[PDB]
Amino acid sequence: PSPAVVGRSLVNSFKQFVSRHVDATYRLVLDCVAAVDPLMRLYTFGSTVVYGVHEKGSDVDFVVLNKTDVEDGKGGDAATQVAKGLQADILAKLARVIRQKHLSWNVEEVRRTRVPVVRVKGGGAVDFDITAYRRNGVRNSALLRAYFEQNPPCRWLSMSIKRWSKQTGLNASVIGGSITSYGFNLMVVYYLLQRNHLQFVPPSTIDVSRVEPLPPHLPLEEPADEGLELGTQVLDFLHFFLHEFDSDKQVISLNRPGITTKEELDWTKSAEDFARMNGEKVHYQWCIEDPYELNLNVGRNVTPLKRDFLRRHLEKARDTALLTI
Ligand SMILES: O=c1ccn([C@@H]2O[C@H](COP(=O)(O)O[C@H]3[C@@H](O)[C@H](n4ccc(=O)[nH]c4=O)O[C@@H]3CO)[C@@H](O)[C@H]2O)c(=O)[nH]1
Numbered sequence: 001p002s003p004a005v006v007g008r009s010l011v012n013s014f015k016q017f018v019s020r021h022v023d024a025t026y027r028l029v030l031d032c033v034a035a036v037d038p039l040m041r042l043y044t045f046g047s048t049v050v051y052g053v054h055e056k057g058s059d060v061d062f063v064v065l066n067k068t069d070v071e072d073g074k075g076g077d078a079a080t081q082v083a084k085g086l087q088a089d090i091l092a093k094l095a096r097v098i099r100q101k102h103l104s105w106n107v108e109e110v111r112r113t114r115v116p117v118v119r120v121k122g123g124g125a126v127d128f129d130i131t132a133y134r135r136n137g138v139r140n141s142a143l144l145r146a147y148f149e150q151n152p153p154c155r156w157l158s159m160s161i162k163r164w165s166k167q168t169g170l171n172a173s174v175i176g177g178s179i180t181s182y183g184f185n186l187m188v189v190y191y192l193l194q195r196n197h198l199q200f201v202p203p204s205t206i207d208v209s210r211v212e213p214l215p216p217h218l219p220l221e222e223p224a225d226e227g228l229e230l231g232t233q234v235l236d237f238l239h240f241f242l243h244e245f246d247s248d249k250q251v252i253s254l255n256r257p258g259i260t261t262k263e264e265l266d267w268t269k270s271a272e273d274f275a276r277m278n279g280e281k282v283h284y285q286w287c288i289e290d291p292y293e294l295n296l297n298v299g300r301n302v303t304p305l306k307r308d309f310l311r312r313h314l315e316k317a318r319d320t321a322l323l324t325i
């Protein structure tokens with residue numbers, strides 16, 4: 001279809017969607033964190049901070065932090081066994097308090113993973129995750145927020161790809177998905193930066209000691225050109241990731257302006273024999289560099305099977321206006 005046909009279908013799929021309740025949740029959680037240790041900062045991150053709007057089927061992410069974690073505003077995050085042990089421990093404690101205060105709520109401590117996390121379902125249309133002692137999640141939400149503030153309307157491209165990636169089964173929330181919603185946001189931003197619709201923000205300029213624990217609403221307008229700006233962006237995104245991004249030689253990166261190579265990171269076939277993450281092999285078929293973590297591939301679950309699926313789906317979106325027409 002034309003940019004206009006695509007832009008118009010997408011805007012109609014979002015007309016139901018356009019229509020600071022977080023504060024009340026924040027406070028309920030801090031009631032709990034204060035019961036463990038009252039000197040503890042509670043910080044919001046996730047899409048609610050990236051977008052500045054609180055979505056539909058959308059939970060909130062919080063992290064617990066010490067005064068001195070917050071002062072070490074640019075400190076990296078230890079991947080040691082000591083580092084995780086410590087965080088699993090403070091979340092044990094906070095989990096016990098949540099449960100004592102709120103009987104209706106399910107509170108699960110997840111252990112299959114790189115990052116300890118406590119997962120809360122209240123049922124009332126209230127879900128959230130609490131992590132502990134980590135700055136990179138508030139850091140990278142703040143950076144993608146920086147980027148979307150440059151250009152408020154660009155969030156419609158972002159949101160359109162988020163929803164599609166769940167519809168196609170590519171998204172890591174779905175069984176058999178390989179890139180998280182977070183990884184797709186790195187891709188959209190990377191794309192936008194290569195078209196010159198955003199000026200580069202170096203990742204080291206983001207300081208946790210300077211971010212608002214619960215940041216302001218960034219209002220979302222309806223596209224006023226009937227979605228022409230939008231369907232042109234969608235169609236371009238997909239062209240760029242199909243016939244412009246060289247997945248065999250290049251890495252999707254936000255650490256640098258310009259191209260990053262698989263070769264300069266040692267993100268090669270040889271390296272797949274030696275790289276492991278969660279007692280499992282890491283794949284360097286579709287390479288996405290985390291801005292803050294050491295030598296972390298966000299597309300590390302994109303096996304050669306899943307790299308094929310992604311091409312296939314990027315082609316189908318060209319015709320169906322991201323599965324809307
Ligand atoms: O691979 C990831 C995935 C998520 N994130 C951060 O967590 C935020 C919300 O992620 P969500 O996928 O809703 O829930 C996550 C987070 O609460 C937590 N998490 C996971 C990975 C991580 O690096 N940091 C982190 O806090 O684990 C859960 C299961 O993936 C994103 O916006 C990112 O800033 C990442 O930094 N890396």
Ligand SMILES: [Cl-]
Nearest residue numbers: 239240242243
């Ligand atoms: Cl193309």
Ligand SMILES: [Mg+2]
Nearest residue numbers: 059060061129
């Ligand atoms: Mg979450």
